[PDB]
């Protein structure tokens, strides 16, 4: 069992400090490898340049073609696959455009049928996708 | 349980509640002390002296009769060994095991038992150093052990 002596504070504290490293989330947050590997580098959003448009096949048992864009970030130059979520919003994005990209909602984990996609497009050409979808603002042009 | 064995025996002695000398015992304190001195001069450890007194002279407990223990009586008289009897027996047993082991190199059990005996010797030596019975430089060494006892 555990030691219950009156002078065992050092042992208890040292053991807890050493056994906190077997927690997945504590080690992920305090090790530094995840932060280094994160393309955003800890930011909530990022800006990138749309390299191209791609279609990702939805994982089984669902069957569909999810429209995504390959983009390259401006601050570090990494390449990222982002999702354009709406019905027909892929026609609002042109190549070589500048887009704002945020996370998908699961802190770096893939969401839904889309395999290996953890980012989504928020604004394209400095206007929000919601405004374009609802017809409140037009593309600058 | 045992210090170096899994056994958990219960065999021991139970002294009677009464501390008074029995009426039939005719011996006085001085006579018992003289018997103790004669036995010690004969070359007997205090344990053997107590065994002899119990078996032959009807002396159930010397501390009840003379008011003192055998070792303290010997120390007061001056007929006391330099090192305690239990440590002497442990060192003698270690010497015997080591003498056996040198002619039998493949007896791993003897090596295990020798390690246990030497651990007990170290424990007892440290305890006796704490009580200043031994000088704070006395050391048990295998070579010196034969001359020690």
């Amino acid at each position: 069992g555990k030691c219950r002596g009156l002078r065992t504070a050092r042992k208890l504290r040292s053991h807890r400090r050493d056994q906190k490293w077997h927690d997945k989330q504590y080690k992920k947050a305090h090790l530094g490898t995840a932060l280094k590997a994160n393309p955003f580098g800890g930011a909530s959003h990022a800006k990138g340049i749309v390299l191209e448009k791609v279609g990702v096949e939805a994982k089984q048992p669902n069957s569909a073609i999810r429209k995504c864009v390959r983009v390259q970030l401006i601050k570090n130059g990494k390449k990222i696959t982002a999702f354009v979520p709406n019905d027909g919003c892929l026609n609002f994005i042109e190549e070589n455009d500048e887009v704002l990209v945020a996370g998908f909602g699961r802190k770096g984990h893939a969401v839904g049928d889309i395999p290996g996609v953890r980012f989504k497009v928020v604004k394209v050409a400095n206007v929000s996708l919601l405004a374009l979808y609802k017809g409140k603002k037009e593309r600058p042009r | 349980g045992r210090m170096h064995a899994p056994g958990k025996g219960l065999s021991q002695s139970a002294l009677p509640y009464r501390r008074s000398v029995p009426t039939w015992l005719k011996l006085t304190s001085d006579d018992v002390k003289e018997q103790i001195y004669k036995l010690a001069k004969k070359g007997l450890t205090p344990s053997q002296i107590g065994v002899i007194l119990r078996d032959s002279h009807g002396v159930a407990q010397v501390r009840f009769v003379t008011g003192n223990k055998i070792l303290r009586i010997l120390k007061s008289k001056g007929l006391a060994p330099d090192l305690p009897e239990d440590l002497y027996h442990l060192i003698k047993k270690a010497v015997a095991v080591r003498k056996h082991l040198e002619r039998n190199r493949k007896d791993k059990d003897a090596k295990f038992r020798l390690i246990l005996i030497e651990s007990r010797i170290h424990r007892l030596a440290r305890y006796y150093k704490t009580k200043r019975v031994l000088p704070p430089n006395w050391k048990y060494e295998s070579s010196t052990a034969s001359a020690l006892v």
């Binding site: 002596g5 009156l6 002078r7 065992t8 504070a9 050092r10 208890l12 504290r13 | -």
Partner: protein, 151 residues
């Protein structure tokens, strides 16, 4: 003779030992008057300091030091430097979270005056604070009490 071991002459600065006198008083005894002082706080001057002949400018009784500050205690652990020893102070540090304690220790280099002799490893020493005598020494030995095993 035995005192004079350095390249410079070892003298007590506040004692004038060249006072001339008649030839009758020279024959009697060449006994220099000793300089000593009471350090206060109830500590008594060891007889070896008053009757001794050693020279030590850092001695609390016959030297030019002042005892003011904290009075602490320790156990003698090492005696290998010249006129200075190393003592150890043990204590317990409290950890609020676990409601328990942990054992901790500190080491102090303190100055030992020649008046204190027969000091062994493992006896209790009461030291007092003074001005920095060296890089690491800030305390001076005031009292020495023997261990429990004294005969």
């Amino acid at each position: 003779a035995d005192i004079q071991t350095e390249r410079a002459y070892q003298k007590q600065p506040t004692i004038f030992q060249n006072k001339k006198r008649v030839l009758l008083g020279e024959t009697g005894k060449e006994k220099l008057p000793r300089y000593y002082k009471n350090i206060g706080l109830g500590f008594k001057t060891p007889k070896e300091a008053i009757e001794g002949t050693y020279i030590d400018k850092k001695c609390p009784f016959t030297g030019n030091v002042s005892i003011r500050g904290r009075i602490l205690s320790g156990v003698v652990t090492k005696m290998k430097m010249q006129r200075t020893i190393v003592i150890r102070r043990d204590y317990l540090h409290y950890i609020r979270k676990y409601n328990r304690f942990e054992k901790r220790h500190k080491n102090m280099s303190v100055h030992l005056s020649p008046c204190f002799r027969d000091v062994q490893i493992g006896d209790i020493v009461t030291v007092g604070e003074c001005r920095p005598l060296s890089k690491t020494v800030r305390f001076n030995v005031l009292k020495v009490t023997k261990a429990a095993g004294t005969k």
